Design an enzyme around this catalytic site. Structure first.
Site, PDB file in Angstrom:
ATOM      1  N   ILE A 198      33.954  33.296  38.724  1.00 54.47           N
ATOM      2  CA  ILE A 198      34.557  32.987  37.419  1.00 54.47           C
ATOM      3  C   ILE A 198      35.061  31.548  37.422  1.00 54.47           C
ATOM      4  O   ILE A 198      34.735  30.762  36.519  1.00 54.47           O
ATOM      5  CB  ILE A 198      35.694  33.961  37.084  1.00 54.47           C
ATOM      6  CG1 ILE A 198      35.137  35.319  36.704  1.00 54.47           C
ATOM      7  CG2 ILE A 198      36.542  33.427  35.956  1.00 54.47           C
ATOM      8  CD1 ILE A 198      36.221  36.422  36.607  1.00 54.47           C
ATOM      9  N   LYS A 275      45.126  49.213  48.117  1.00 52.51           N
ATOM     10  CA  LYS A 275      45.525  50.376  48.904  1.00 52.51           C
ATOM     11  C   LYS A 275      46.562  51.136  48.117  1.00 52.51           C
ATOM     12  O   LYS A 275      47.275  50.542  47.311  1.00 52.51           O
ATOM     13  CB  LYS A 275      46.098  49.977  50.266  1.00 52.51           C
ATOM     14  CG  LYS A 275      45.776  50.980  51.380  1.00 52.51           C
ATOM     15  CD  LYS A 275      46.127  50.422  52.752  1.00 52.51           C
ATOM     16  CE  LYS A 275      44.887  50.052  53.576  1.00 52.51           C
ATOM     17  NZ  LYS A 275      44.065  51.241  54.022  1.00 52.51           N
ATOM     18  N   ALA A 278      51.648  54.581  48.871  1.00 54.16           N
ATOM     19  CA  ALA A 278      52.121  55.374  49.952  1.00 54.16           C
ATOM     20  C   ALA A 278      51.583  54.816  51.266  1.00 54.16           C
ATOM     21  O   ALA A 278      52.173  55.056  52.317  1.00 54.16           O
ATOM     22  CB  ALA A 278      51.696  56.796  49.757  1.00 54.16           C
ATOM     23  N   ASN A 327      46.314  50.416  37.490  1.00 57.72           N
ATOM     24  CA  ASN A 327      45.127  50.851  38.190  1.00 57.72           C
ATOM     25  C   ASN A 327      45.442  51.490  39.542  1.00 57.72           C
ATOM     26  O   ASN A 327      46.291  50.994  40.297  1.00 57.72           O
ATOM     27  CB  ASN A 327      44.219  49.650  38.421  1.00 57.72           C
ATOM     28  CG  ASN A 327      42.786  50.039  38.524  1.00 57.72           C
ATOM     29  OD1 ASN A 327      42.319  50.911  37.790  1.00 57.72           O
ATOM     30  ND2 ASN A 327      42.070  49.402  39.425  1.00 57.72           N
ATOM     31  N   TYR A 333      48.303  44.009  43.119  1.00 57.52           N
ATOM     32  CA  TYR A 333      47.494  43.312  42.166  1.00 57.52           C
ATOM     33  C   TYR A 333      48.073  43.367  40.745  1.00 57.52           C
ATOM     34  O   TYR A 333      48.249  42.319  40.111  1.00 57.52           O
ATOM     35  CB  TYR A 333      46.075  43.888  42.213  1.00 57.52           C
ATOM     36  CG  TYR A 333      45.066  43.069  41.430  1.00 57.52           C
ATOM     37  CD1 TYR A 333      44.664  41.817  41.875  1.00 57.52           C
ATOM     38  CD2 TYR A 333      44.525  43.542  40.236  1.00 57.52           C
ATOM     39  CE1 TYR A 333      43.747  41.068  41.151  1.00 57.52           C
ATOM     40  CE2 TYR A 333      43.616  42.785  39.510  1.00 57.52           C
ATOM     41  CZ  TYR A 333      43.234  41.556  39.978  1.00 57.52           C
ATOM     42  OH  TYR A 333      42.313  40.805  39.290  1.00 57.52           O
ATOM     43  N   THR A 368      30.432  40.220  38.811  1.00 55.43           N
ATOM     44  CA  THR A 368      30.816  39.283  39.866  1.00 55.43           C
ATOM     45  C   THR A 368      30.641  40.054  41.165  1.00 55.43           C
ATOM     46  O   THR A 368      30.560  41.291  41.163  1.00 55.43           O
ATOM     47  CB  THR A 368      32.304  38.915  39.789  1.00 55.43           C
ATOM     48  OG1 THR A 368      33.074  40.119  39.636  1.00 55.43           O
ATOM     49  CG2 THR A 368      32.601  37.959  38.629  1.00 55.43           C
TER      50      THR A 368
HETATM   51  N1  LIG Z   1      35.733  41.176  37.397  1.00 59.06           N
HETATM   52  C1  LIG Z   1      36.430  40.231  38.024  1.00 59.06           C
HETATM   53  O1  LIG Z   1      35.951  39.565  38.944  1.00 59.06           O
HETATM   54  C2  LIG Z   1      37.762  40.052  37.589  1.00 59.06           C
HETATM   55  C3  LIG Z   1      38.583  39.053  38.181  1.00 59.06           C
HETATM   56  N2  LIG Z   1      39.900  38.929  37.851  1.00 59.06           N
HETATM   57  C4  LIG Z   1      40.592  37.667  38.155  1.00 59.06           C
HETATM   58  O2  LIG Z   1      39.889  36.491  37.740  1.00 59.06           O
HETATM   59  C5  LIG Z   1      40.126  35.453  38.700  1.00 59.06           C
HETATM   60  C6  LIG Z   1      38.777  35.033  39.304  1.00 59.06           C
HETATM   61  O3  LIG Z   1      37.970  36.198  39.629  1.00 59.06           O
HETATM   62  P1  LIG Z   1      37.157  36.314  40.991  1.00 59.06           P
HETATM   63  O4  LIG Z   1      35.917  35.263  40.837  1.00 59.06           O
HETATM   64  O5  LIG Z   1      36.684  37.701  41.208  1.00 59.06           O
HETATM   65  O6  LIG Z   1      38.291  35.844  41.982  1.00 59.06           O
HETATM   66  P2  LIG Z   1      38.241  35.960  43.642  1.00 59.06           P
HETATM   67  O7  LIG Z   1      39.144  37.032  44.181  1.00 59.06           O
HETATM   68  O8  LIG Z   1      36.619  36.113  43.954  1.00 59.06           O
HETATM   69  O9  LIG Z   1      38.764  34.496  44.163  1.00 59.06           O
HETATM   70  C7  LIG Z   1      38.604  33.301  43.389  1.00 59.06           C
HETATM   71  C8  LIG Z   1      38.601  32.127  44.348  1.00 59.06           C
HETATM   72  O10 LIG Z   1      39.983  31.967  44.751  1.00 59.06           O
HETATM   73  C9  LIG Z   1      39.934  31.461  46.070  1.00 59.06           C
HETATM   74  N3  LIG Z   1      41.236  31.609  46.730  1.00 59.06           N
HETATM   75  C10 LIG Z   1      41.852  32.673  47.247  1.00 59.06           C
HETATM   76  N4  LIG Z   1      43.033  32.278  47.754  1.00 59.06           N
HETATM   77  C11 LIG Z   1      43.130  30.968  47.543  1.00 59.06           C
HETATM   78  C12 LIG Z   1      44.084  30.093  47.843  1.00 59.06           C
HETATM   79  N5  LIG Z   1      45.151  30.557  48.471  1.00 59.06           N
HETATM   80  N6  LIG Z   1      43.984  28.794  47.522  1.00 59.06           N
HETATM   81  C13 LIG Z   1      42.838  28.337  46.854  1.00 59.06           C
HETATM   82  N7  LIG Z   1      41.850  29.264  46.559  1.00 59.06           N
HETATM   83  C14 LIG Z   1      42.021  30.553  46.913  1.00 59.06           C
HETATM   84  C15 LIG Z   1      38.831  32.264  46.760  1.00 59.06           C
HETATM   85  O11 LIG Z   1      38.221  31.467  47.803  1.00 59.06           O
HETATM   86  C16 LIG Z   1      37.834  32.492  45.621  1.00 59.06           C
HETATM   87  O12 LIG Z   1      36.725  31.597  45.725  1.00 59.06           O
HETATM   88  C17 LIG Z   1      40.974  36.069  39.807  1.00 59.06           C
HETATM   89  O13 LIG Z   1      42.328  35.826  39.534  1.00 59.06           O
HETATM   90  C18 LIG Z   1      40.737  37.527  39.673  1.00 59.06           C
HETATM   91  O14 LIG Z   1      41.881  38.254  40.172  1.00 59.06           O
HETATM   92  C19 LIG Z   1      40.242  39.387  36.625  1.00 59.06           C
HETATM   93  C20 LIG Z   1      39.478  40.384  35.988  1.00 59.06           C
HETATM   94  C21 LIG Z   1      38.275  40.884  36.541  1.00 59.06           C
END
Ligand SMILES: NC(=O)C1=CN([C@@H]2O[C@H](COP(=O)(O)OP(=O)(O)OC[C@H]3O[C@@H](n4cnc5c(N)ncnc54)[C@H](O)[C@@H]3O)[C@@H](O)[C@H]2O)C=CC1
Ligand SMILES: NC(=O)C1=CN([C@@H]2O[C@H](COP(=O)(O)OP(=O)(O)OC[C@H]3O[C@@H](n4cnc5c(N)ncnc54)[C@H](O)[C@@H]3O)[C@@H](O)[C@H]2O)C=CC1
Lengths: 427, 425
Positions: A198, A275, A278, A327, A333, A368
């Site tokens: 994303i 997780k 509990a 969830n 989260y 994703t």
């Molecule tokens: N379907 C999905 O993928 C959904 C995602 N989310 C949120 O959207 C946002 C992006 O989604 P994803 O691509 O799945 O996120 P992701 O969990 O794949 O991580 C996004 C990027 O953040 C980086 N990251 C992690 N810790 C970091 C740090 N401490 N400093 C710098 N970078 C760090 C990771 O290397 C990763 O490339 C996230 O906040 C996710 O929680 C929201 C809704 C659904």
């Protein structure tokens, strides 16, 4: 859709998304109703759209005229003859006046009730079409320029996965970008977690729109992050956002590349350590809070406070459906993504006094690696449990983000938008 | 069949209210830190088994958490004790109203709690439920305005309210003479009361002390009488959409209850489902006039002529459809959203007057309307944290809570009664 028989469910529409050159809607634009919005809107949209006075591309109904519940009759009168005729991926948008700000309780009750209508209509529309409801402040001048970026987002392909939602537009005037199709001309955007997925796609859309991008991710993901900075023709930066120096490390990379200033921070980086509570340990809790809540709050407070982002700035935070509905196995989260909504809401007035807006996007089901990691049936059902009968695309999220970043979306702050296809799940 | 098997369900038989039974199935543990833990312990010592078997209730005081880094408290309190929570157990997090926090940090943190409670609601086993209550940071330490909510939450009456968010203000509360007879000596107008829900609201009210005025249309004359007799209140035939409506009730309040009623329930409602592209004026206009125009016309009328005054209680019936919308129901959901509208809008005006107006949005409730095909019936039934549809009592119980004289600091509220139905906004 390989379980269309098992769930009693239609084949999806292929959703039209943005392409430069193509007209914004696939049909004529009807702007009905009465109130303070129909005339100026007809006016601001003359040139770029195709106004009545075949197939309807868009339907806008002006509800601001409606001052008592007895007037709600209008929605019926306007919509009933025209739905017969809405095109492929049509756009219905009802416009009302901020219910809390109404001139009578009577007015308030009608404007409030609008959402019931819009969220229901969103469930009746066919072949990829969507509904949206937008409230405008009753203290907006009648030209209503503050409403423009929003109408333009919805009244286009970019809002392709934004359905059934409610927009909340303030009172300030807006100024159109020289070019709507390059709205982010010479803007400096910081995008965290931009290695892949994303985050990476945000960068793309931002670049496509005109911005110079600072792609932030960790050292573990350089190569994939390099490939991204490259593609958007921006700049990479290896950084853990949870570390004491992070604010200092961003500010300086800015100072060495962009005159020490930025226009847009996108708190996208995030992790999930799922997780049951509990069975939850301190480590699986803490990590998620650090990255997902503590960090984005720090970077916003940091970079505004040190003057890296000032007037006309934009902060967009990545929320989630989980933070609204809850969830299983995600109390960490979902605390964090609910907190994200809290940052957005808590900081909106303060930042408003600094000429800065702050908003969150809450993605639903997005293809994703992460949805791809879910047992296919659980996954396939999830993907299909929405008005739009499909999974969302990473471009669709970034679009909504890019709409927030817009220089003309200045009147839009503290907003929370789901990019969810009108997923059925909610609070 | 295969899908069901694939996905993985064990609905618990939900414990409901019974005169005499204790309000929990186990002892109550009140933890956390802040301005709620000490007073809540003291208010509840008599009627509950506080911790010096398994836990009947868990209450974590979260008002103490003032920055995000301290959210970790949630995890430290719940994790260890979760494994020990009983059948139909209860989890309640009490917090500070976010909008009114003393810093933006607090605001972030207290707003953050809803993600927690909604998710935890989704992990609890054996018919147990979660709840979030926010208390005005302006309430006095005694916290007397909170009790009615805590006592309803921490009881079997709240058996089908799961995952919700309750909003308690600053005002002090006087407890009723009898917590088991809360509505004792109150007069309650319950519209749509011949059958199902409305008829059950009337029962729960009798149970609680109320002198009910059971209201309905003439065609349902027969079922009204049965209801009216069962509860020992009197009946009134009238169509709520008659221009005389208010005047007729008012007349009846003189004839019977000193021109006075304490509670109004806008239960009467009707459907008329149609895709909007087939919607005719009748089907639009009927529902509108019955579900939205009427309820307002009664409330405004009966407070305007003084029939309901200081100490008053208007409770309206929303619906999940009004929150999430629903195919075929642009008309209907417009109304039920309007009901929230009535509630949010008339609340400050009535507050100034000594009256609280609140709303209840049922999920899927076992009733004679739900006449719905076994394909749709079986899914709406089971698509919530509690794995079943709700009984009418569950709904009326929640209404009874608002209606308490001790629920004076509870106003402006919309509480879904849906056992955390999956669907929402
Ligand atoms: N379907 C999905 O993928 C959904 C995602 N989310 C949120 O959207 C946002 C992006 O989604 P994803 O691509 O799945 O996120 P992701 O969990 O794949 O991580 C996004 C990027 O953040 C980086 N990251 C992690 N810790 C970091 C740090 N401490 N400093 C710098 N970078 C760090 C990771 O290397 C990763 O490339 C996230 O906040 C996710 O929680 C929201 C809704 C659904
Ligand atoms: N699953 C459910 O049962 C749900 C119910 N709803 C709401 O609950 C309320 C009642 O519940 P149900 O028992 O299921 O509906 P219902 O139709 O079974 O209730 C019947 C009552 O409404 C009365 N009524 C209709 N028009 C009237 C009028 N003009 N004047 C006086 N009475 C009138 C009928 O005479 C009857 O007494 C309705 O407002 C409905 O919108 C809320 C959520 C879903």
């Amino acid at each position: 859709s390989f379980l269309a028989r098992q769930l009693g469910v239609p084949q999806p529409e292929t959703l039209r998304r943005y392409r430069a050159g193509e007209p914004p809607l696939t049909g004529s634009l009807l702007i009905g109703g009465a109130g303070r919005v129909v005339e100026p809107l007809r006016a601001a949209l003359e040139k770029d759209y195709d106004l009545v006075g075949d197939s309807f591309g868009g339907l806008v109904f002006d509800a601001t005229g409606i001052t008592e519940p007895a007037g709600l009759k209008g929605l019926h009168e306007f919509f009933t003859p025209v739905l017969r005729n809405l095109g492929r991926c049509g756009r219905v948008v009802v416009v009302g006046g901020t219910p809390e700000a109404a001139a009578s309780t009577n007015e308030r009750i009608a404007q409030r009730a609008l959402e019931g209508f819009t969220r229901s209509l969103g469930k009746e529309l066919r072949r990829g079409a969507t509904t949206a409801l937008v409230y405008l402040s009753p203290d907006a001048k009648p030209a209503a320029t503050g409403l423009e970026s929003t109408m333009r987002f919805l009244l286009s392909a970019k809002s392709a996965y934004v359905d059934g939602q409610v927009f909340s537009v303030g009172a300030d005037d807006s100024t159109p970008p020289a070019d709507w199709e390059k709205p982010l001309d010479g803007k400096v955007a910081i995008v965290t977690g931009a290695a892949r997925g994303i985050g990476a796609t945000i960068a793309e859309v931002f670049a496509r729109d005109g911005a110079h991008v600072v792609a932030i991710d960790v050292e573990s993901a350089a190569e994939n992050l390099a490939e991204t900075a490259s593609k958007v023709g921006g700049t990479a930066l290896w950084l853990d956002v949870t570390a004491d120096d992070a604010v200092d490390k961003i500010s300086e990379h800015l100072r060495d590349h962009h005159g020490g200033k930025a226009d847009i921070l996108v708190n996208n980086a995030g992790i999930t350590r799922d997780k049951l509570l509990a069975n939850m340990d301190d480590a699986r809790w803490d990590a998620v809070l650090a990255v997902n809540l503590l960090a984005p709050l720090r970077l916003t407070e940091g970079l505004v406070g040190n003057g890296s982002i000032g007037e006309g700035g934009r902060v967009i935070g990545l929320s989630s459906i989980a933070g609204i509905a809850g969830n299983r196995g995600q109390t960490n989260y979902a605390t964090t993504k609910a907190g994200m909504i809290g940052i957005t809401q808590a900081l909106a007035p303060g930042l408003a006094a600094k000429g800065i807006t702050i908003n969150a996007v809450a993605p639903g089901f997005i293809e994703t690696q992460m949805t791809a990691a879910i047992p296919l049936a659980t996954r396939e059902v999830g993907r299909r449990l929405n008005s739009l009968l499909q999974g969302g695309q990473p471009v669709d999220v970034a679009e909504a983000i890019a709409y927030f970043a817009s220089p003309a979306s200045n009147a839009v702050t503290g907003n929370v938008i789901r990019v969810c296809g009108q997923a059925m799940i909610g609070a």
